[PDB]
Symmetry: D2
Subunit: 472 residues, 4 copies
């Protein structure tokens, strides 16, 4: 059972909008909205969305596997060895938010302070002492962006696995000599940095010039979660506020995906007339170029929705019914909808590029979708005894060395329940960078934004106050 299997199982259920049923349903962790900062829903006047992995949640592992395959095929087409074609995507390896170290060719899982939690070279998981040779302080300076690339999006899952596959392959292939910073093949030297750039380039190519979009749209049921409750929630949002779409995707792809997401024989509820997807939005903006969108943005353009091409010129006119925008900036949205930042709840999956930037640059309210939570929550509850034992061991150690090997064992067994690179949110008792960023920049979070459907219009989401140590 993948996280998208969980999401789709919940998607298949019709909405029981009885008030007691809703209250009962959102008690469950799976259908809950989690709160890092208090948020009064009555103050929200605009609800905004990203599309990819927010409205359109791609099914796992099928979509990652398609991405992986196409990226492999691209590398082979530019001259990588044929053996790459024997790789096959393995969803049990990558966890989101890993750091690729381009100097030494390692995948690293780090905490909020750059401390190493996990280090793998290819498929070899390096133990603490061997880690010190390359990381003397068990630390990386993560904003050294010339060296470190943080694999923070769900689109980065295939390349996370592919990087490890490639390091493994070159290491074990007798044609190459393993060196500290890459591989020697006679008079050719392939650094991990050059290899990483090739991978990054190929992933970008697959998305923008290759067949990934085409292959997705030709089998949307295979590749995209679909939920008849989506139009119900959007229609309810529109009763109390304005609704907007701001997506990096282009209009043609957006229209294909959104048309699919709304293709039911009814509109908001069973029995109601079907309505086009565009009718659910007060403002539709494509080619957003986030994160730049949250600063200067780009020139505001209008989409010719008949052709899918941009009209020639900058659009200087007002908001009108049926217009579709391209580019612009977050200020376009504010101006056209008559909103200030705190009137907006922006809903997305990209914890850096959208959620962090909308919060930091504009003071928008934020709702982070974390699709993996739909399954991570099942693991968390099913294996609560391991975490609780781990807590009790940390307690017992602190008030006091057979305990230390035991702390490692339980940490390992716990982490392995999630996958080879452990939980998105922690390794044993240590929180990841990703977890820290969620807590810091997402006001609200959940496995799906659909969980908003189970809270009433003016619900007050409450987080407990944070006190300093000297205040406690």
């Amino acid at each position: 059972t993948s996280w998208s299997d969980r999401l789709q199982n919940a998607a298949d259920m019709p909405a029981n909008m009885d008030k007691h049923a809703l209250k009962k349903y959102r008690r469950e962790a799976y259908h809950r909205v989690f709160v890092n900062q208090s948020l009064a829903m009555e103050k929200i006047k605009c609800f905004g969305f990203d599309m990819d992995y927010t409205l359109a949640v791609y099914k796992s592992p099928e979509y990652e596997s398609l991405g992986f395959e196409l990226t492999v095929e691209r590398l082979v087409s530019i001259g990588y060895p044929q053996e790459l074609l024997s790789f096959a995507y393995d969803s049990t390896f990558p966890t989101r938010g890993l750091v690729f170290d381009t100097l030494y060719g390692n995948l690293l899982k780090v905490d909020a302070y750059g401390n190493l939690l996990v280090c793998a070279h290819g498929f070899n998981f390096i133990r603490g002492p061997e880690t010190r040779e390359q990381y003397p302080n068990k630390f990386i300076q993560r904003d050294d962006t010339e060296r470190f690339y943080i694999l923070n999006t769900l689109f980065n899952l295939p390349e996370t696995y592919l990087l490890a596959c490639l390091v493994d392959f070159f290491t074990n292939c007798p044609r190459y000599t393993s060196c500290e910073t890459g591989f020697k093949d006679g008079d050719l030297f392939m650094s991990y940095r050059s290899m990483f750039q090739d991978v990054r380039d190929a992933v970008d190519w697959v998305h923008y010039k290759g067949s990934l979009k085409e292959k997705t749209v030709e089998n949307l049921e295979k590749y995209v979660v679909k939920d008849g409750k989506l139009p119900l929630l959007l229609s309810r949002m529109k009763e109390v506020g304005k609704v907007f779409l701001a997506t990096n995707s282009d209009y043609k792809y957006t229209d294909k995906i959104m048309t699919y997401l709304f293709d039911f024989p009814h509109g908001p509820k069973p029995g109601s007339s079907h309505r086009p997807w565009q009718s659910y939005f007060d403002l539709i903006l494509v080619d957003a170029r986030k994160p730049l969108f949250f600063g200067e943005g780009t020139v505001l353009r209008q989409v010719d929705t008949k052709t899918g091409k941009l009209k020639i010129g900058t659009y200087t006119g007002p908001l009108q019914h049926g217009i579709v925008y391209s580019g612009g900036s977050s200020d376009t949205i504010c101006d056209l909808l008559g909103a200030k930042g705190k009137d907006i709840l922006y809903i997305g999956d990209h914890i850096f590029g959208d959620i962090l930037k909308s919060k930091k640059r504009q003071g928008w309210r934020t709702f982070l979708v974390i699709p993996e939570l739909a399954q991570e929550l099942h693991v968390w509850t099913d294996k609560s005894s391991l975490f609780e034992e781990l807590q009790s061991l940390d307690i017992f150690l602190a008030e006091l060395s057979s305990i230390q090997r035991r702390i490692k064992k339980v940490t390992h067994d716990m982490d392995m329940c999630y996958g080879m690179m452990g939980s998105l949110f922690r390794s044993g008792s240590r929180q990841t960078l990703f977890a820290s960023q969620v807590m810091r920049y997402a006001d609200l979070y959940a496995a799906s934004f659909i969980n908003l459907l189970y809270y009433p219009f003016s619900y007050l989401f409450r987080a407990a106050h944070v006190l300093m140590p000297h205040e406690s």
Copy 2:
């Protein structure tokens, strides 16, 4: 009673090093070390220090007042009006960490997300609705450093007050016409931005070319806290590890100040031979140029300690007894002391420029000195009933509008106990940016680093684990 009065009262006490007495003493909030991140003291092998406001804590309000007076005198000398000479420093106005908005000439107290907590134009404290005219989202983007300057050091206290004095003065002086972005004086327009730059320039001038250092050193008892327990603590640190000084100050000033701080008729304990200040350090580095120090730094130089001048050339030799370094980088320290970052506890007051940068760039352990805490803790405990009422009002409101005006009143009365700009750490129930940065980048904090004297050599400082909402 100022915070430095509290510090000096505690400084005057001799050290009772009986183990029960120590344990009893550190129970008290005033003598406690507060813990944001767990830290095993046995793993610390090097203790490093800043000098100014860390080892050498300048007395308040006398030192701020001297700075203020000299800065005023400098502005008058460059052509500001004579009325400036009638200003007098008022310690009840400024709190550290305020933001000067150079566009509109306001001092702002903000939370970690840039939300406005307090806004004052001169001495006029602007209420919520009037604030919306200039700050439509009650928000600033604080890293817009062309517009906003954050007054984060204790050296910035005099200019914090001086900015408000100047805005008040120009506003109420009939020679000038108040405009949205500054003041018109016929065919001269003085923007708040130009005024701010003049103030900043004058403060820098007073420190580097004016008489502030000279006036400080001619009356050190007036201006600098002195504690006979300082050599005791440093001597104890040296029994278990290495001790270093890394200061932005120059050698001549450093030597004057440090000589004063160690000028007792004894060394570490009463009855012991006096030892020169330099003997307490394994490594002494001046002209550090932090924060650049924590990246590329500057060329490593050697001080001729006879003349106070730099020897000509880059120093390429080893660590030797009696050598004093100038410039260099944090890597110099690591190399020369044979330390990795996590072996180092760096002790300082500058929450951005030293503590944040040493943590983020190098993974050093950090101890933040917050001198104002020595008095803020007295206010916190004395007025606990106001905060607790505030908590109970927030609770009672949330589970449910005569309450809202009551929440404002109690918030105001609480804040005013600290001063006109409230607590360093909060306004009512909302934490400041400064508080958030302390929690994020200081492993340990206290009103004085002397509080380390009351914990045993291998003490384990414990912070409770942080759990995410869905983990709780």
Copy 3:
């Protein structure tokens, strides 16, 4: 008769290598090498070449017309109006080296100091006084690269004409309102800057992703000058030194073009065995990325010449027979051929990107190919009486207002002999920027590098010494 017609007529002649015949032949301006700086050919040890418009001179106006048509088709495909399809390339309009002013939508011909010589808005040539409205000092600051784009390559000829066509079209089309900085089409505003960027983008697209290369290679006789004397000259160069190719083009295109340029039933001379093009080069480097090539360059790669793809990795090996390089830097060439800059004569058409940069950054000797000279020289000699009258009028005026209108008339009539935008090298008696750059950065220049064939191996090219006014 176009310049390429002149070049091809000379190309069709066999080489008479009798020493008297050669000396007689190079007397003629058409077959001469012109000298700005003295150059001792015996000191040249390496001869280097660019390919496009140097070895492979594209026929005019056919190649410009193909580029124009494809660029038009691309703009229409992205949403420009259908009327664009009625444009047809006109070789009588553009001269190379014009400046497009993106603010006001003008093509400008300027002197070396930025003084306006000619200003056209669409097809309207603006007279002196009307020019002052937009250019009050009849001057532009040409390195304001955000505003001005200098159209310096022969590849820029189609877009030079297309820009004027588009300004004309939008100006005269009643759907649009002409504004100072662009065109209003209801609620769309198309600035000249956005229009220019679209044109630039489309030209780049045609070259790199469109059908221009394909259409060229399918009819090389239509599109490329071919000269059986090319292998003779290259073979002679190889007798006295090393020969290299450094081209921005890719290997596959390079191989197609070069194979065509050497496709005769003989090698260097009639009767000799044909030899592959690669055999004429000691070093072949593609994907050069000039001008960056003359600084840091890019990573040195090796071409797999069987597939046309790059081998994976940086190439660390030596120069070997048959190897083809990609990327690298000018230092690669120097190192591998054992040359210093002054031992190299670099032969190319790109007066900025190759000739200026190789001279300024590396001190290479330079030979500039100026294909238009093959026809400009015919105009220069045929209309010498107009220029001489112009000289006599400037003389007679200076030693002294019916003369001023006469100076304008003769200037106009002279310029119009070259085309609507006049000579590449001057307007009347005023030299262009392009002329000044030729004099400054090209040691030698000619209509074709083939003219080197007519000078003996160790010829000394002589330029007269330049004296200052006070030295004269």
Copy 4:
């Protein structure tokens, strides 16, 4: 006889303004204005000036020697060795426009293309072959400003000599070991780069914080050329146009110097009332910060001429009688005087920072003062036979190896007539970079701007047309 002796001898002569006398006087090379670009004086409507080395020509070698001495004293005061005090300025060594190579510690004289003409390490003049070890192509890339500093101003003459003195001193002092990039003194390494920066810093210090200005103003007759013809020329300029001052110097220094330059018992002519210096200017601007002045400049301020301090605020008012400006930009001048660039003749000595930038950025007309020409012209005419022999040897060689050693000998003997680093304008038959920049950016040039006095109001300065080789 120094160049300033020549200037002062001519300064002591009264103006004979008879038209025949003037025409006869300007025939002589010493009193001539030299012409690189034709310039119609009747079109000039504004005459602008720099002060230092333009209006105020400092006497040589006395002023260089004072600068040298004070710079030496500053270096000793910061810890350089006492032996520096035994140096004494030698005007026979430095020529203006040399390049200091901070890598290898050489002074280089280069041509316009970066080719080495002269290379000295300390006082050792390195011959051609030994030069190739460090400069394999006898070439430097002069805009590598991290490595090369071009000593282009007359203020740089003392440091030119001091750099050579220091390299000599350290080389020959047995305490130091000479290395390729600097000097080793035990565990101190002084690179030529660090040494150069110290020198540069010290020169700046002497000018801005040391006693150079004070020592100059206390003996103006010793240090500054004074010419009673100065007010006559400025008064004549004011009859036909506007006159402005734009100087980097501050008001107080400007007022001292200018007051001295106008301190005669008469005004424009003998017998006329004395008038204050300010009365000769329509616009006076100090603290100009050229070259930035010719781009964005700085904020426009007004000087309080009673105090010498700036008024507080940006000056927004009009041009009024008696106002003195500070900062601003070249656009301030244009706006306030109602001038376009070509209406302005800007008169200065700084061939980069003023003349080049005013021409390139604004299209101003330019008059370059070259004080050394007042003596270089005497050498040029007195030793014409050496140059002519050199020309005849170059001719005879070219149409054809006892000649090559002869070309070196005559080149050496010629150059040595000017000084150890030869003529400002050439080494033998090769022009310097400085010469090329004069020809390129100065419309007019002369040893003094006073030479304008000898040409009538609407004189037409003529330069011959430049033809390309193929046009000739």
